[model samples]
Target: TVDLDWKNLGFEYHKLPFRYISYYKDGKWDDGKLTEDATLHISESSPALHYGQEAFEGLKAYRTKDGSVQLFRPNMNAERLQRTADRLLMPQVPTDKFIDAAKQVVRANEEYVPPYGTGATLYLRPLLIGVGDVIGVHPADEYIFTIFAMPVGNYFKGGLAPTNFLIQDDYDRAAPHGTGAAKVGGNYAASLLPGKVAHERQFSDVIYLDPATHTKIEEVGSANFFGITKDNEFITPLSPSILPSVTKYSLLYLAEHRFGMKAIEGDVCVDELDKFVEAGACGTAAVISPIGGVQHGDDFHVFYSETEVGPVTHKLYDELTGIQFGDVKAPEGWIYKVDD
Candidate 1:
């Protein structure tokens, strides 16, 4: 096993020994293999660099208490990447191939997988980009798919603790009918400034309003927005301008089936923040970060508590993290074991 400080790890990149990379050319993909080099030799005129023809995904390899490694719903990431590719007019990386590549990377860098109970996990980043010489505003004829990993701790500095957020009306991450539903780099590119501005003001991140309506809550930074109502209903915004988060869907299932709460997906207007007793931002990275408060212009709304996590939010976090660490039973087809 590796000797690094597992529990104190921060969310950052460490160049590992191996990564899985495959090339697509001439209407076909080559059999992928593990490579030691981390750099990509692509054309300067590639569309992924210029025209924003790039897509990526994030998932983690959890270290179970039994010293076993596994992935949570990697196939979901694969399928999501496929959808992203389809939206960008790029070639699809089959789900099987995606899962196989993830396994290979995990197996090759097994030592980097953090120990159980340390709250750190091997974070895998699967990136697909349109490469080759293409300067025009069109898709590249060639593509590259790669998966790299690094051990990471909590994405938010607060971890499971509640943190404040800023809701801005000036900027929108994506358009009403844009590629927000797809996991692409361009959408994040648009959020960098707003995110930075929020951080400058001492908030965790920005809560974006829908571009068209400018009233409904769309997303919390790069994560999906979710709120627990006073009536025991789990409500998340439903719109084409939000990325369909895998963790959000899992929580929706758990909230309704496991916890016996009403699951809902519809409009969540900023004016109706008072209806929610607790709120959070969920995604693979954020992993259910409780939104303690939100600042919108002159009005600042606080949910649950500014310093403490609510009881229901705490329960959801426990259940989700327990299942992730193999302490609690996960739903069927959610856990994919990695062989040594």
Candidate 2:
């Protein structure tokens, strides 16, 4: 019931009335509470600012047809954030605390959860950062965990349409055997330049190659990559240098268990584009961006169609979004209802 246009909302920030924040010091986390302050005041010499000791997660609150709100696999995001914290040498925000914080924030800002039919939902960002004034290159003794909420529409403009991407041979998203699997800020910092370059050239985003070989497709921008082969198999890259998307895993499960398609996680070579009849990118933000074509050096390979989404991709999108919005039945333990 906010005055904003729910259907036309873009993927951006609108400072809501409340957010959940907690602090960690002297070895444990304090109970979190909802607050109205939107600005965060951290030390300038914090390890999160200098050594990049930070982790973040993205998930959404959907408005069901019956005027109820629920979250899709928030525990998974909580666990992923815990893993990222372990990788960064930071403190883990417990799953119970994380889900409680999320529920608190959503409940406090219930008015902003957009209507069920608007194609918009309340997006939550859970951020964990190392703080304290330690200048040395090590984890800080203190930490801050906060969860913010905003309403967002389609992340990719034109929503579900097949778009082109640029394959960059010069840049790699993450180092091999590094913090690639962790949802940290450093990995995205490395992609800013390449992402901008792809945007300048009229591509939706950059398709990155594996760091070691620079031959296999590691990821598609900030999202995970998936290709549907002409043989009706679902394939995504298996690498230590890419972020494991929660949405991607859900699709893999849905594709194999629900649709009876063969799901695979293996090497996807850039030169083997001929095997796939359809391709797309999946993540919390991007949702499912159908990759119509890929431009690599001088060759531009098109999958499905440049303007039209493929049949399989379309069906998957329907099923995924349907479950997300509470229209279709979701898998067990997938939906978490938020109490009013």
**Tens-digit lDDT track of model 2 for 120-210:** 8999999999998998698899999999999997554455788899998888778998899999999999999999999999998999999
Model 2, position 252: C-alpha lDDT score: 97
lDDT by residue for model 1 over 1-340, one digit each (tens)? 5998887788899999999999999999999999999999999999999999999999999999989999999999999999999999999999999999999999999999998778789999999999999866999999999999999985544457888999978888898889999999989999999999999999999999999979898889889999999888999999988999998998998898889999989899999999999999999887888988999889889988998898888888889888988999999999999992
Error of 2 at 189 (Å): 1.0
| TM-score of every candidate relative to the true structure | 0.98, 0.98
Model 2 accuracy (lDDT, Cα):
0.91
Clashing pairs in 2: none
lDDT (Cα, 0-100) at 92 in candidate 2: 89
248 Cα displacement, candidate 2 (Å):
0.5
Query: What does the lDDT read for residue 42 in candidate 1?
Result: 95
Candidate-wise lDDT, in order: 0.92, 0.91
Error of 2 at 142 (Å): 0.3
Q: Evaluate model 1: give its lDDT.
A: 0.92
